Amino acid sequence: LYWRTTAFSVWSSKPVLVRNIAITGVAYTSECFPCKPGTYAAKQGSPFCKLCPANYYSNKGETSCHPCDADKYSE
């Protein structure tokens, strides 16, 4: 795979931004992984761990995001 960007020198730009590159069909079967910190999964079979809502926090392997303290904030 190639990603290439050439900018024309028009004396002016905002760079191209790329995220979430997902390539399927590699290495046949793969194994399950614990959810990353700050992410939660509710039911089995999740292809991705949903992000915990703001003002809430969580850790690895959690099935739910614990509520946070009153004197604390969390993106």
Partner: protein
């Protein structure tokens, strides 16, 4: 079951095998209290 910090766990040793190797496992001070315990090491 919320994740446990350094306080609620003690580190205990498994049973000695034939070759003489043990595993340092981490045990909740009282049963059923947390997950994501530190990985056992030789």
């Amino acid at each position: 079951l919320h994740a446990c910090k350094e306080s609620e766990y003690h580190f205990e040793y498994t049973a000695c095998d034939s070759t003489g190797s043990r595993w340092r496992v981490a045990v909740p001070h009282s049963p059923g209290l947390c997950t994501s315990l530190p990985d056992p090491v030789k």
